Design a protein around this ligand. Structure first.
Ligand code: APC
Length: 409
């Protein structure tokens, strides 16, 4: 009956070790920590976008104006509000203001076809108020009083497989934010580069950890990203300390660094994922990039709050596939066969994800039914699981259990 039924004790033990990830994080909820930072570090730079820099004081005053506007237009807590996803300051006031209003944001590329925008507004149940007026130039006002609710929806982000709106609530975002800050030692004087647009959820992993610590969110300009050599120059010039990259984009940077060895003395962390890559590439990186920067290899779908697993990439290895590693705090992952049985170590199965990272679901009740299911994995432990469509196997890597990606169904 249980998914681990046919496993021997040693095979069951490997999975129990792998998924031993429960962690309580200190003190106030995400928005309260953001408010505390703004009041303790008001003069610090909070966002450096393509059109200038806002202090924490200014960002929170602009966000407060947005929340007050939404309330004045009858947008009640638990509503969804569209924000125009650009590289400028205004979207940061928009999305923080939506959260201060007790609402969830849906990031919209203002260059998308009008027909696709129309679908997103209807599917998300989202008001276009902040698409039809500049959110940065709204009349000044304090944020209205929002009654406390647990696990409010924070965002609806569209991901494809056919667009589906992933509904992500505060406990998942708070959990991710604690991990980014604690795992990568984010400090007030740090500069978190945002490579992903606000329509792509690695942006979440840069924005909230910055504002939860008093660090500065530094938007990567469009023109810089598409030019690998310029991107390396820009990272040096802006003294970026933490960066999000998709694997293929990082490969473009590696080729540029091989052509012209780079110095990045201020860079401490690159969080990289999206595709399988190889220790030969990461070994080359560490020879041609003069930096203390460590590569944190990550895996995860949008449906499980950006990242689900992480591997600290060894710089001395130069052969084999980089594993996707161990679950984030309060995540549990299972490789299941076609009959929903837990695979032994070394056996390839489909990744199912449990824990604090899971989306509430999709906007579509049908899509939610097909993707999310309940399963007794071990005696006594019934899990809400998200089916990924991803394949992996549990392997031994440097005397520790790790997932190794094996492709898709
Ligand atoms: N480290 C890694 N190695 C291999 N595959 C990875 C990976 N990290 C992520 N993936 C793949 O990327 C998927 C997650 O995709 P998402 O992060 O949701 C963006 P997407 O859905 O590919 O694009 P979209 O949201 O723009 O439509 C995983 O389900 C897996 O297939």
């Amino acid at each position: 009956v249980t998914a681990d039924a046919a496993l021997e004790p040693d095979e069951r033990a490997a999975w129990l070790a792998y998924n031993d990830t429960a962690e309580d994080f200190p003190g106030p909820h995400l928005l309260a920590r953001l408010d505390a930072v703004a009041r303790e570090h008001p003069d610090r730079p909070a966002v450096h976008a393509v059109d200038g820099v806002w202090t924490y004081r200014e960002l929170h005053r602009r966000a407060d104006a947005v929340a007050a506007f939404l309330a004045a237009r009858g947008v009640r807590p638990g509503s969804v509000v569209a924000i125009a996803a650009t590289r400028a300051l205004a979207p940061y006031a928009a999305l923080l203001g939506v959260l201060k209003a007790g609402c969830a944001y849906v990031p919209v590329n203002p260059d998308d076809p009008a027909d696709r925008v129309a679908f997103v507004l209807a599917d998300a149940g989202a008001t276009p108020l902040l698409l039809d007026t500049d959110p940065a130039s709204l009349p000044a006002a304090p944020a209205p009083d929002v009654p406390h609710e647990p696990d409010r929806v924070c965002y609806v982000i569209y991901t494809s497989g056919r667009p589906k709106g992933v509904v992500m609530a505060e406990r998942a975002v708070d959990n991710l934010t604690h991990w980014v800050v604690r795992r990568h030692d984010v400090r007030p004087d740090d500069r978190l580069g945002q490579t992903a647009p606000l329509t792509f959820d690695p942006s979440v992993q840069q924005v909230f950890p910055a504002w939860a610590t008093g660090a500065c969110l530094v938007t990567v300009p469009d023109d810089v990203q598409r030019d690998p050599a310029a991107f390396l120059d820009w990272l040096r010039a802006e003294r970026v300390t933490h960066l999000d990259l998709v694997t293929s984009h990082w490969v473009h940077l590696l080729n540029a660094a091989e052509a012209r060895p780079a110095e990045l003395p201020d860079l401490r962390w690159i969080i990289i994922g999206g595709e399988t890559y190889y220790y030969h590439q990461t070994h080359r990186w560490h020879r041609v990039v003069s930096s203390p920067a460590r590569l944190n290899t990550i895996y995860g779908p949008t449906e499980a709050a950006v990242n689900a697993t992480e591997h600290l990439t060894e710089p001395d290895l130069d052969h084999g596939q980089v594993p996707i590693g161990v679950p984030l705090p309060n995540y549990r992952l299972y490789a299941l066969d076609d009959d929903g049985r837990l695979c032994p170590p070394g056996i390839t199965g489909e990744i199912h994800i449990a824990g604090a990272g899971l989306a509430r679901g999709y906007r579509s009740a049908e899509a939610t039914a097909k993707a999310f299911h309940e399963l007794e994995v071990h005696s006594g432990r019934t899990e809400r699981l998200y089916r990924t469509g991803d394949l992996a196997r549990l392997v031994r890597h440097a005397d520790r259990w790790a997932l190794e990606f094996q492709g898709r169904v």
